[PDB]
Amino acid sequence: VMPICGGISAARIPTADEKKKLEPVLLQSLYAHLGSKPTSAEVVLVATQVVAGTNYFAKVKVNNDHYIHTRVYEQLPCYGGALELHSVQMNKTDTDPLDYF
Secondary structure, three states, X not given: XXXXXXXXXXXXXXXXXXXXXXXXXXXXXXXXXXXXXXXXXXXXXXXEEEEOEEEEEEEEEEOOOEEEEEEEEEXXXXXXXXXXXXXXXXXXXXXXXXXXX
């Protein structure tokens, strides 16, 4: 009854390869969004939007202190497969819903 294109999966727990995929990218790109460089950035929850490629939405523990939500776009393999940070929702709670933005 529901579309394929653009639908967001249920927020769930990352895999060991999702964390290795995402966190190094978050450590490098988060300063342009947060205005400081994080000392740590932990993907605690992830949800996936099917797109031409994949939008990863993530609940992210920053500096083991607080939470943000991140949108990271993953290219299709033929486009190279790079991952890039698209935007940030700051100042979130640990049970804030991991919703599309």
